[PDB]
Every structure is written in C-alpha cells, then in structure tokens.
Design an enzyme around this catalytic site. Structure first.
Site, short mmCIF file in Angstrom:
data_model
loop_
_atom_site.label_atom_id
_atom_site.label_comp_id
_atom_site.label_asym_id
_atom_site.label_seq_id
_atom_site.Cartn_x
_atom_site.Cartn_y
_atom_site.Cartn_z
N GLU A 35 0.84 -1.23 0.02
CA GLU A 35 0.07 -0.01 -0.07
C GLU A 35 0.64 1.24 -0.12
O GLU A 35 0.54 2.10 -0.98
CB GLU A 35 -0.96 0.11 1.28
CG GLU A 35 -2.04 -1.05 1.14
CD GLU A 35 -3.18 -0.53 0.02
OE1 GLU A 35 -3.05 0.52 -0.51
OE2 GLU A 35 -4.13 -1.53 -0.11
N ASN A 46 -7.28 9.54 -5.76
CA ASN A 46 -8.01 8.47 -6.64
C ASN A 46 -8.82 9.35 -7.56
O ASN A 46 -9.16 10.53 -7.33
CB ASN A 46 -8.90 7.75 -5.74
CG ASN A 46 -7.98 6.76 -4.73
OD1 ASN A 46 -7.84 6.99 -3.73
ND2 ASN A 46 -7.68 5.77 -5.66
N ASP A 48 -11.91 9.33 -8.08
CA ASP A 48 -13.10 10.01 -7.68
C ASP A 48 -12.98 11.24 -6.73
O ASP A 48 -13.88 11.69 -6.00
CB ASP A 48 -13.96 8.79 -6.80
CG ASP A 48 -13.32 8.67 -5.57
OD1 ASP A 48 -12.04 8.97 -5.49
OD2 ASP A 48 -14.02 7.82 -4.63
N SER A 50 -10.93 11.25 -3.99
CA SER A 50 -10.73 10.79 -2.71
C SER A 50 -9.17 11.01 -2.50
O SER A 50 -8.55 10.87 -3.75
CB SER A 50 -11.41 9.61 -2.25
OG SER A 50 -11.00 8.51 -2.95
N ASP A 52 -5.84 8.50 -0.77
CA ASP A 52 -5.59 7.32 0.32
C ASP A 52 -4.37 7.91 1.08
O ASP A 52 -3.48 8.45 0.59
CB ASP A 52 -5.27 6.23 -0.45
CG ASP A 52 -6.09 5.48 -1.33
OD1 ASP A 52 -7.47 5.52 -0.97
OD2 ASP A 52 -5.88 4.80 -2.48
N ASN A 59 -8.75 5.67 2.84
CA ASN A 59 -9.44 6.46 1.97
C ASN A 59 -10.20 7.46 2.68
O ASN A 59 -11.07 7.12 3.41
CB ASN A 59 -10.33 5.78 1.05
CG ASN A 59 -10.93 6.42 -0.34
OD1 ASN A 59 -11.87 7.06 -0.21
ND2 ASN A 59 -9.96 6.63 -1.28
N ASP A 101 -15.38 -4.18 9.47
CA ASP A 101 -16.30 -4.24 8.49
C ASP A 101 -16.68 -5.43 7.69
O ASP A 101 -15.68 -6.23 7.75
CB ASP A 101 -16.23 -3.21 7.29
CG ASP A 101 -17.28 -2.75 6.50
OD1 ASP A 101 -18.10 -2.15 7.03
OD2 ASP A 101 -17.30 -3.38 5.43
#
Ligand code: NA
Ligand SMILES: [Tb+3]
Length: 129
Positions: A35, A46, A48, A50, A52, A59, A101
């Site tokens: 990562e 990113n 969109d 966003s 990271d 994110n 999650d």
C-alpha cells in the site's frame, strides 16, 4: 517516517494487529508494504477525488476528513493528516475499524491482490518479535 520490514512488524505487533479480527501479523506487514512501501507519509489521489493516506492507504471517502472529497464521511473521526504521522497509532486504530467491516481485509485492494492466499508469514521472517 519510512519503516524497515521488521521495524514495522514490531510496531504493528506492539499496537495489537497480530491476529486482530483473525488476521496474522504477516497480513498487516504485507498490506503496508504494497500500500505505502512502509511510508507513513504516503498519499495517493483517486479518480473520484478521494485520497488514500498513510501506511495502510486509508481513504477519505469513508474513513477520515480531508475537506476535499465531495460527499465523503469520516468514520474514524480524524483529520486524514493524522494518518501521516511517524507514530502509527491513528493508522492502526482506524485500520481496526475498517477490518471490523463485513469485507475484512478485502477493503485493502493491495492486500486482496498481493497478500491474500500467499505465504504471508514470510513478511515477519527474521524479525525481532
Ligand atoms: Na472524508
Ligand atoms: Tb460495510
């Protein structure tokens, strides 16, 4: 801060990630390697809008506030900059909420594509633990 493989393994072990939600330490080191290349200051924009952030590339769409992700949330209730500190505490605490999650470590694309199903214990081989 740029960690060494065994240095991060030890830092992550110290902060309780070994077998957290059933994921052995090697899974966490392998994920951080791909990562961020073990860099707490890593950031990736990113498509969109966003971003990271940090050792585990957390994110801004869902997990932290950076003030520039249109329509985002901050479920770890932290500024995204807190995920870039030399002290990995904030990154570990937020990672603990992400992995709790329903999708577990599949939340980390690099983990799913490069760590999952591999001999991840090799990532802690020769480490002071
Ligand atoms: Na956000
Ligand atoms: Tb979910």
């Amino acid at each position: 801060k740029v960690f060494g493989r065994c240095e991060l393994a030890a830092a992550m072990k110290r902060h309780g990630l070994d077998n957290y939600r059933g994921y052995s330490l090697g899974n966490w080191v392998c994920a951080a390697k791909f990562e961020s290349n073990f860099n707490t200051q890593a950031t990736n924009r990113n498509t969109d809008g966003s971003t990271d952030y940090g050792i585990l590339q957390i994110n801004s769409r869902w997990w932290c506030n950076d003030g520039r992700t249109p329509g985002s949330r901050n479920l770890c209730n932290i500024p995204c900059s807190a995920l870039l500190s030399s002290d990995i505490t904030a990154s570990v605490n937020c990672a603990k909420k992400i992995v709790s999650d329903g999708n577990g470590m599949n939340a980390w694309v690099a983990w799913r594509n490069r760590c999952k199903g591999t001999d991840v214990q090799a990532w802690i081989r020769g480490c002071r633990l």
